[model samples]
Structures are given as structure tokens and as C-alpha cells.
Target: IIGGEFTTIENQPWFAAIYRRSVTYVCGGSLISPCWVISATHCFIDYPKKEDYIVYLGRSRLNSNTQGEMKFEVENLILHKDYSAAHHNDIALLKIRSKEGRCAQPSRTIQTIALPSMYNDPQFGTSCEITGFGKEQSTDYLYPEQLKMTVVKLISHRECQQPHYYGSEVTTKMLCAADPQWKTDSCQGDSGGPLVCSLQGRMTLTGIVSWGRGCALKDKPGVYTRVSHFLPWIRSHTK
Candidate 1:
């Protein structure tokens, strides 16, 4: 999370970390099932290496030791066919490798998130939260070791494409949101993180960090892959 502060994931247990070779934090993800993870398609753009991908859970601090932390190898990656490194259809799903025929064993800090049915549509201006081990600021030299979070307000696609924001190509497949009043938004390493909102007191994923102009820029809300728009595609791979 960019321009955000350290936070806990106890209330948002489905938040997860995508690691490179189980060592370096590459991106963020959301655990949707014991054996499945969802993230941005661009995250797999770097030669989709299932052998080199790992999922980390129960720990917010990526570089520290947390007894609760659990590791799982990526058995396979399911990316959108039209996915390009920096363009449209930027969402993907990952399968967790099972051991002894079991995937992740959920605990207090690690759990699965509830999927929003295709009929559910979050309203405009709804407040949501995002958590990740992304850069603390745009100019930061490295990504934060601990996870961070911030709140952002949903922005209409028309407003997000104004002169000061993304400026163009904001489409139906994307959801634009940000806090125009605050200096907080997702940045590098935050891609694929879950953008969750409170629904009937449950934290549900409404979007996935996909792209933005820069870290925390004025009027430049972060663009996310609207999860609801891809229910059919997601359901196909998840099963």
C-alpha cells in the first residue's frame, strides 16, 4: 500500500502475499479457497513460472519470522488469455499445491475470502480497504517489510478519466477508486492485492489492484480489475 501505515490482517484474513521462489515479495493476492488464490494477470507476466511462485500466509511482515506463517508452492497459474504486461484483462487465478491431498489449513491469520456473487454490485462512492507490502511512498527505495493499509473511495469511471487522473482508456472491465482527499493509494508491489469492502459486516473482495499512473498522485485514483465483471471467467478456473 502506498502512502499508508502499518496494520494488522486479523480482520482481513484472506489477504496473502505472492513471493518469488518463496523468498522475495513480488505481489499481493487473496485466498479464495483452501487451494486457490486470485491476483492481477500482470503479476504473472514475467514468464509465468509456477515452479518459482510461492504463496505466503498468516504473516504481514514479509522479511521477518512469524510462527504462524505458512508456505505453499503454486501448482499452476491461470491467466486471462488477453492479458498483456501493461493493459486490459489484468486478473488471474493461482492454484495451490496440495501435500498429502490437502491445501492450506486455515487459522486465525490465514483464511479464505467470500466471493461476491455475479448479481452483487457495489455502489459508487463506497469506502474500501487495501492491504499489501508495497512501497511506503512513490519515492521509496524499497517495498516495506511489513504490510500496510489505507482506505479509498470509489470513483466513477468518468471522473477517473478526467485530465488529472488516468486520462484515457478507463473501461467497463475496470473499477476506478481513490481518496482524492488523501494521499493514499496502491503502488509498485501492490498489484494483485485485494480491494475489500464491508458487506453485511464481512470483508469481501470487490476489486484487485491492477494499475495506476503513479503512487499517490492528486486525482489519479488506482485502477482495479472489477471482480464482479469476471465472475464467469473466475468461476471456470476456480472449479
Candidate 2:
């Protein structure tokens, strides 16, 4: 994430690296359960094959191996039936399994994140953290190998939809967040990453990095898939 500090797996164990061909970093995802990961559907627009992607967990670096690192192949990708790149129903779930049919094995460096309850959406101004290996700036051609993160406050839907802001693009199915000064944001390659907030003493998955006009641009906060809005959709497919 742009203007963020480097982080480690211990600090963000649920963070996942979605790779193409087991070699190319494509997007970020979050481990929500032993066998399920959540990401943005837009990330698979080009590479639609279930066998085309590999998931890496417990790693802080994109290409380097970390302690307790584990890799899994995607068994299935369930994109939201209403997903539309133009309007944005961008959430998706991935069923992952190892060669032995095992999924994520929880450890100090690998674990699942909590998803918010149907009635538990974060407040408009609640502070949250977003983690990813996306570009540090709009002009950067390369995504960082190290995991990075930064704090952002949730934005009000009315404010985010102001004529000067995202206008009509903001919706109930989406969330808006930005650094108070608009200096920190999720950039290219951060899509499908987790936007988590501490609630009821536990870190909960509040948003999924979805889209934005630009990196850290004023009035152009990063948009995320509102996880709470799709509780039924996620639950029905996961089990």
C-alpha cells in the first residue's frame, strides 16, 4: 500500500498472495477460513482458470520464503453472480487446497481472519488497517515484495459520493476509506486485499480492496467491497 510501513506475517497472518502461474504476483486475498479465501472478482478478469492461480500464505515477502510458509492451489473460485466491473459487486471466494487436500494450517504465522456479522458494519469514521504488496505510488511500475500496511478511517457514503468525490459510484455494497490527509491508499495490485477493523476485541474483515480512481488522490478514497453486505452470499457458497 502507498505510504505505508513494512509489516510481517505475525502482524497480518491472514494476508495472502495470489499468484499467476505460481510465479507472478497478481492480487492480494485474505484467509477467512481454513479452506476459504476472499478476494476481488476483478482480479480474475483475465486469468479465469482455476488452475492458473496459486495461493501463498504466511509470507511477508512476495517471492521469498518465510518461516512456516505454505502454498495451495485454488480448487474453485466463486465470483458474485452480480459482479460488474462498471458498477462493482467485486467480492469473490476461493476454495484452496494443498496437494494432500489440506487447506491453511493455522500457526503463529498463518491463520484465518474473522468476518463481520450481518448486522455489524463498522461506523463511518472507524479506523481500520489495510495491508498489501501493491505499488507504493501511482507511477510505480513495480509492486513491493514486502508486505506493507497503513491506517485509514472509514468515509461516510454521503461524503464519498459528493460531486467532487466518487459521485454516483459509491453504493451501499461498497465502502470508502482514506488517510485523513489522503496520503495513504491501496494502489495497483492491492485489489482483493483485506481491510480489517478491530471490533468486539477481535480483528474483523470489513472490506475487500476493490477499486479507486487513483492512488491517494484527494477526494478519491480507496473503494472496497463491503463484506458485511454479502454475508448470505459468502455463507451459502463457503459451506
Candidate 3:
């Protein structure tokens, strides 16, 4: 989340940390199920081994002792076969490996998120919440040591492709959402994070942070992999 502020773990329980070798946060993800995590496929294009990545849930602050944080080793990677460096089909799923065959124990501080139905798409101008441990758009541009969140208005795809924006990279499978004037945006470490929106009184996963021209840059809204559009693909792989 760019230009966002620190938040509590209870506020975003389904959020997951994607660490590189358990040392650095490279991307963010969401727990869609006990053993399943969803992220941007482009984040794993290097095809790193499952063991190379660690998924941390229930942790809001990285530098402090997080009592309820549950760490898991990745057992598998299910990236979209058509995913490319160009950022198409930029979403993936990670299967967590556990001795008992369950990834996380259900608790107040750790839980899975509700995914959006295929037919649901938040209308234009809808405000949604996005959280991540990503960098902000300030001059200093610090990668947050703790989780942060921000609210962004959903911009129409047409508005997102204006002359100064992302151009034709926008597609039906992808969605654009940002403040018209670029007061907020998704940043680097935020990739693969959840863009959750309120729908029918429920928090639903509607988008996966994919790419952008730059963090919070003027007229360059963030791009996301439309979760509702990939319902079948995700279900097929997870099943």
C-alpha cells in the first residue's frame, strides 16, 4: 500500500507475507484457504523452489515479536501457465505444506478470505481497502517494516488508459483502481497482495496486485489481476 499507514493484524488476518529465504519481504499475498495462498504469478516467474519462500500469517509488524504469527513452508506453486514477464495472467497460488496436512489453524488472528464470485465486480468509484508491507510514494519511499493499509477509489479501465497512464496493457482479465489524481497506489512489496472490497456486506477478494507505471504516480493507476475473472482457473488448480 502506497502512502498508507500501519495497521493491526486483526484488521487484515488473511494477509500473508512472502519472504525470500525468510529474510526479506518480496511480495504480499492472501490466505484464501487453510493451505492455499494467492499471489501474483509474476512474483514467482523465477520459479524459485517452494522451500525458498516462507508464508507468514498473523504478523503485522516484522521487527517485533508476533506472538500469534504462524509460519509455513511452501509445498507447491501453481502459477498461470500463460503468465509472462510482460505481466499477463499475473496471478498464482501457493500450497502450504504441513505435517498434519493443514496449513493454518483457524483463530481470531489467522483466517482465510472470501473470494469474489465470477459475476461480481465492484462498480466504478467504489472504495476498497488494500494492505501490504510495501514501500510508500514519499520522497524517502520506505518499505514499511510493518503492515500498512490505504483506501483507493476504483477507476474505470478507460480512465486508466489515458495518454499518461498504463496504456493498452489494461485488459478484461485485469482491473484498474486508483484515485483519479493518484493520491494512493500499490507499491513493489505489495505485489500479490489482496485488493479486498465490500460486496453484499462481506469482505471479498476482488483483485491481486499486479503492476503499475509507478507507485502513486500521477495518472498511473495500479493494475490488478481481476480475481472474479479467474474463478475457474483458481478453483481448478486448488481442487
Candidate 4:
């Protein structure tokens, strides 16, 4: 059950073609490196073993049985040791073993997304794009597509503090919210996907889609895990 707009790696030309062929087992993720993907820890809670998941590197459209894409058997599932699903500290790193000898390429069609640096400050009110295979609405079932995307404005902490935003769940520790006014927002399938923004004319990964109150409901902003907060962890694990 996945739905939303399509997403390709930021700078990699092979993005669309790779996404057209890839399969995401848990939450959505960006191929930050040839072997690494950033995703949500919660997506793997039910399946602690790395062998249980598969990463499809360059896929588009669902139903991959007929269409072929590069498949990678997961080598490691690096969940933040302190990650707590209930409180939403759920972020993880996935190390994939590419079946194809060569990594996914960035020909005219493929591209890779960039990760924001630890010191970068993302501007509030900026419109960020999120892509996933989640449902369009709370009531709707997952779409059988490889991906979907939508733009949402970043809401200030003060605005998110309003009683209606996310209640007490909205915290400054790795949390951000999207404006509720926009009828478009993330759904179930969007979890672990990238919340991307163009900073200084370059696309950067700002956050990871975490949760929201059923797509877009007035005053209920969509929440994401602030990527800046986890820079140390990311570097430690990836380096």
C-alpha cells in the first residue's frame, strides 16, 4: 500500500530510472550513497533482521513482478540505539548489497539527493517537497505506485505549539511540522521518506517524514524528524 508523487535522487541522473525499479520494504528513503539509505527505525521494528528486507534501487510504478529493477539484499539495519517508536526517535540507516556489480548510475535519467550539513539552518515557511508511496488521504488505501510527492510549507515552532498543531507530540528535539492549511500532506506510506528543500539553489535533505494526523486536516500539521538533530549519529554510523 504505497502512493504519492515520484522522487529521484537530487543530483543523480539515474533517479527516475532507479526509482522506477527500486522497492522500499519499510519506510521510504533516499540513496544518499551507493550503498546507504536513510530511513525510519520504526519501519524495521517488526523485522529486526536485515535479511528480512530488500532494497530495489531503480524502480518506478508498483507491481515489480513483471518489470525488472536492481535488487539489493540488505547487509545491515542500523537503528539508532536510543530510537523509541512511541516518542518518535525512530530513524535508521540501511546498508544495501547491490546485486548489480555496478552501483545505480546517473545517466541522463538518474540522480542522487544531497543531505544537509549539521550546521545548516533550514528556513521556516519554506516549501519543502516530500515523496512516498503512501495514501492520498486517511480514508484511502495505499496506491499501487512506486512513489508520490507533495509540497508543504515549514511551520514555525511557535505556530506548531498551538494546541491544535500536534498537542504535546511536537517537540524541538528532531521534530518539525508542515502547515495544516495545505490540504496536501503525507500519509501512512510516506514515513521514512525525504522532506527535501532547495537551499542556496541546491536541493538538500532537511528531514524525514515521521507522522501526521491522516494526511491534511486543518490545524494538524505533518511532523518530521529533523535531520540536523541526528547528524552526529549519521556520521558516526556512515563514516
Candidate 5:
């Protein structure tokens, strides 16, 4: 994430690193349950083969072997049926399994993130965080080894849809967030990461990194898939 500080797996246990062919670190994800992970549909639109994907959990560094780090093969890659890039239903789910056909085993540095139990938008300007291993700058192709996190505040949907901003492109299914200076933001490789916020006394996976006009550009805040908007779809597939 651009303009963010280094973070640890212990601090973000639910974080998952999605890899392509166990070589390319493609995107970030969040563990929502023992076997289910939440990510952006756009990340996998091109990689149709489930065999090409692998997921790693409880890792602070992308390429290093950390204590308690666990790797899992992707059992399924499910994207929203109506997910249109132009319209923004950019969420996806992954059913992960171990080599032995087991689901995630919770540990000191591995756990699931809470999903919103109700539908609601975080109030405008509410402080939240985005975590991932995205580029530190828009022009950078190399992603950081360590996980990073940045503070971002929720932007009002009305303001996000203003003519100077995203305009009519911002939909109810998308949520906008950015720092006042637009310095701290999610960039490429960060898509499918978590935009978590404290809600109802628990940290909830409120958003899924989706898109933006550019990285940390003025008047162009990052857009995320509104998790609350797809609760029904999530439940149907998860169970």
C-alpha cells in the first residue's frame, strides 16, 4: 500500500497472500472462515485455472517463510455472476484447502476476520485501514516483501459521485476511501485486500479493494466492493 507503514502477520492474521503458480504474488485476500477467503473478482478474471492459484496465510513477508505460515491450494474460484467491471461488483470468493485436503487451522497468527452481521455503511470520514502488499507508488512494478497498512477514511457516496470525482461511475455496491492528502492509498497488487473497520465492537471486513482512477491521485480515491451489499450472495455460497 502506498504511504503505509510495515505491518506483521500477527497484527493482521486474517490476511492472505494469493499467488499465481506459487511464483507470482498476484493479490491479497482476507480469510473469512476456515476454508473461505474473500478477494476481488477482477484479480482472477484472466487466470481461469484454479490449479494456477495458491494461497498463503500468516505470513508477514511475501516470499519469506515465517513462523506459523501456512500454504493452501485453491479448491474453487467463485466470482459474482453479475460482476461487471464497469458497474463494479468486483468481489470473489476462494475455497482453500491444504495439500491433505484440510481447511485452515486457526493458530496464534491465523484467524478469520469478522464479516458485517448487518447491512450499513460506515459513516463518512470514519477512520479505517487498508492492508496489502501493493506498490508503494503507481509507477512501481515491484511489490514490497513486507505487508503494509495505511489509514483511510470513508468518503461520502455523494461526494465520491461528484463531477470532479468519480462521477456517476460510483455505485451503491462500491465504497470510496482515501486520506485527506491522498497520500496513503491502495495501488496495484493490493486489489482483493481488506478494507477493515471497527463496527459493533468488532473489526469487520467492510470492503474489498476494487479500483480507482489511479493510485493516490487527487480527486481519485480508491474504490472497494461494499461487503455489506453482498451478504446474501456470500451466505449462499459459503454455507
Candidate 6:
């Protein structure tokens, strides 16, 4: 069973100040550009409108006194047309309204994560990191002022496909599984967080922390939305 309190980029002196206020909620997003941020569809399913959520950028912890004022506004939200809560086809994009005369500070700005372009080939066995404000487990509250990171390895698809071995839950549609042996995986609040891997010395976005059985347990690998599977959709939507 996975359980523990871990310090995130917030604990790192340099990244701490940069990410302090940059972490947004389930529906919030980062500015991939001066105008856009990628987000999750479920974040807007209930509301179906931009006014329903607030977008915050350019700050680290949400409550930093000395940090520059949080800068952002919800101009528009676009949910994937085919998003279905049951199937987990829930991704979205947000457009931010820019502030006049004020430039977004690089320290407080969001960085664009590169998406994977290949298919279901296993990036498992390779080390990856996940960052989020999600609780340690389903029962904990939102992590205060801190982001959490967990190192995980990709589990083979064959291992995940065996129903008796893991369960019928693991499918090859938009999912991939991470090693369940680590007792260190994502949780309730981690949905939509980046699952990044280092490839050829460059960190690339490989998956999105979608959901999992529990935090971590034997035979139950952490399932993520395979980034490669959504590359076409991502390019179309973000473009």
C-alpha cells in the first residue's frame, strides 16, 4: 500500500519560489503560451462555461505574501467534444485573457511540456516523475503550499493486460500502468498532473495521471492516460 508525505518542487529552494503559486486545481491550467493552457474536461463538465472556474498563473504557493500578485483570468474554456466521464476521455484547453502593460514573469510563468508522439510502446522500466497537489491518499486534504513528486517505473503492457495477474481494469485504449510494487504512486488530487520521462537526456511528457485502483498495491499498477495515444487530439486541440 502506498502511503507517505513527500516534499515536492516546493521543497527545492529554487523551484519552490517559482512554483509556489503556479499550481492550479483540477480545472486550472498553465499558460503553454501567452494565451493557452491545457486542462482536464471533467473540470468543466459540471459548469460547461468559462465563468465557472478561475485561472491563476505567475505565482508559486497560492498564499505567498512577497510573491508577485497572482495574474490570470478565465477568458474561455474548451472541453473535448467526445469527453466522457465514464470512459475518462476527459481533457480540455483554456485560453487566458492577458493583462495590459504587465508582463508575466518567467519565474511565475508556466512551462510547456512536450507530448509523446509514438504509440503504446512501453516507456516502462524507465524512470518517471509525477507532480501534483493531490492528497497523499483519497482521504487527505489538498497538500498545502507544496507539490509532491514520486518516482515510478513503467510496467510491461503484457503484465498489465493479464486480468488474473492484475485485473480486467487494465486496458490498452488510452492507458498505461506503472509498477505497483513501489507503494509510491499518484492519488486523488493527482488527476491531470504530468507523468514525465527522461528520453535521450530530455524530459518529455509521456502520460497524464488519470486514475488508479488505490495509491499503490501489489498487482494494481498506477494507470495513466497514455500521452502518445492522444497526440493527434492534442495537436488538433492545442493548435
Against the reference, the lDDT scores of all candidates come to: 0.82, 0.90, 0.84, 0.66, 0.91, 0.56
C-alpha RMSD between model 4 and the true structure: 3.9
Cα RMSD to the true fold for all candidates: 1.8, 1.1, 1.7, 3.9, 1.1, 4.7
Assess candidate 3 and give its TM-score to the true structure: 0.94
lDDT of 2 by residue, 1-239 (tens): 98979999999999998999856998999999999999999999777888989898998997788878999999998887787872488988999999998989999999999999896777888999999999988898888978999999999889998879998988988899998899998999999999999988889999999999988999899999989899999999998
C-alpha positional error of residue 12 in candidate 3 after TM-score superposition, expressed in Å = 0.3
Residue-level lDDT tens digits of model 6 in 163-239: 75456655565555455465777766566566667776666666666666666766667777676677677777657
- C-alpha TM-score for every candidate: 0.93, 0.97, 0.94, 0.84, 0.97, 0.76
Worst 10 residues of 2 by lDDT: 79-88
Q: Using alpha carbons, what is the TM-score of model 6?
A: 0.76
For candidate 3, give the lDDT. Answer: 0.84
lDDT of 4 by residue, 1-239 (tens): 12234553332222221121134435577677777778877777776878667666555545453243466667778988887762467778887676554555543333567878775746888888777767766776555354567778888777786677676767775555554455678877667777888888888878887776666777877788888777888888988
lDDT tens per residue, model 5, 73-186: 999999888877644789999999999999999997899998986578678899898999999988887889889999999998899999799999999889999999998899
- What count of clashes does model 1 give? 0
Q: 150, model 4: CA deviation in Å?
A: 0.9
Q: What lDDT does candidate 5 reach at residue 26?
A: 91
Off by over 4 Å in 1: 98-101
Off by over 4 Å in 2: none
Candidate 5 lDDT (Cα, 0 to 1):
0.91
Ranking by lDDT: 5, 2, 3, 1, 4, 6
